C-alpha cells in the first residue's frame, strides 16, 4: 500500500484554509489544490509498503505517540518551496513545530532502522496546493505575498494517524489504517 504518517487539522482551520485556497484561485496559475479532507501536517512519507510493516510501524508509532503531550498550534503564514522564483508547493506554516519537529526526528530515525529513507529538513506544514504551471508570475508572487504573514487559526495536535492513500483519477483517496492520541 501506499502510506504515510500524519497530524491532522480541525474544522475551523479546515474551512480556513479552503477559503484561503479560493482566494488564491487558478488566474495566476494552474493548481492542483489539496481537497478539503485531505488537509494535514505530514509527518512522513512512507512510499509503498507492507502490510506487515504498517503493524510494525503501528507498535513504534504508539511508543512515541505517548512520549509527548497534546498541545495547540497556530497555522500562520504562506511559504512556497523550494524557492519563491521556483514554485511548486504552496504550503501554509506552523506557528511553533518544535514538538511536533521532535516528534517527526524520532518517527524517521526509529522507521530508519527498518530500512525507511530519512528526509530532507523537516518543516511542519500543511500543503495548500501544487503548481502545475505559472501563467501570471507578478500576479501570483503579489497574490501570495499578500498572505505571507496570514493568521489561518489554531488547533489541537491530539493524535498521529498511520494513513493509506489510494490515487484515484481525479484525486487521491486517503484512508486512516491507526490512530495514536498524544498524552496529557
Ligand atoms: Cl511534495
Given at each position: 500500500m501506499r502510506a504515510f504518517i500524519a497530524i491532522d487539522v480541525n474544522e475551523s482551520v479546515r474551512?480556513?484554509?479552503?477559503?484561503?485556497?479560493?482566494?488564491?484561485?487558478?488566474?495566476?496559475?494552474?493548481?492542483?489544490?489539496?481537497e478539503r479532507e485531505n488537509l494535514h501536517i505530514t509527518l512522513?512519507?512512507?512510499?509503498?509498503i507492507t502490510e506487515e510493516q504498517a503493524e510494525e510501524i503501528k507498535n513504534i508509532?504508539?511508543?512515541i505517540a505517548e512520549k509527548y503531550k497534546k498541545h495547540e498550534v497556530?497555522?500562520?503564514?504562506?511559504?512556497?518551496?523550494?524557492?519563491?522564483?521556483?514554485?511548486?508547493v504552496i504550503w501554509a506554516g506552523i506557528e511553533n513545530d518544535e514538538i511536533i519537529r521532535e516528534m517527526a526526528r524520532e518517527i524517521e530515525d526509529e522507521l530508519a532502522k527498518?530500512?525507511?529513507?530519512?528526509?530532507?529538513?523537516?518543516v511542519a506544514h500543511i500543503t495548500l496546493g501544487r503548481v502545475k504551471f505559472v501563467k501570471d508570475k507578478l500576479?501570483?508572487?503579489?497574490?501570495?505575498?499578500?498572505?505571507?504573514?496570514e493568521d489561518f487559526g489554531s488547533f489541537v495536535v491530539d493524535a498521529i494517524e498511520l494513513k493509506k492513500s489510494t490515487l484515484t483519477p481525479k484525486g487521491p483517496?486517503?484512508?486512516t489504517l491507526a490512530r495514536f492520541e498524544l498524552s496529557e
Open positions: 474551512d480556513s484554509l479552503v477559503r484561503a485556497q479560493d482566494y488564491i484561485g487558478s488566474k495566476e496559475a494552474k493548481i492542483k489544490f489539496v512522513k512519507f512512507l512510499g509503498e508509532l504508539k511508543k497556530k497555522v500562520k503564514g504562506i511559504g512556497v518551496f523550494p524557492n519563491p522564483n521556483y514554485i511548486r527498518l530500512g525507511f529513507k530519512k528526509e530532507g529538513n523537516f500576479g501570483l508572487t503579489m497574490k501570495l505575498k499578500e498572505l505571507a504573514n483517496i486517503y484512508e
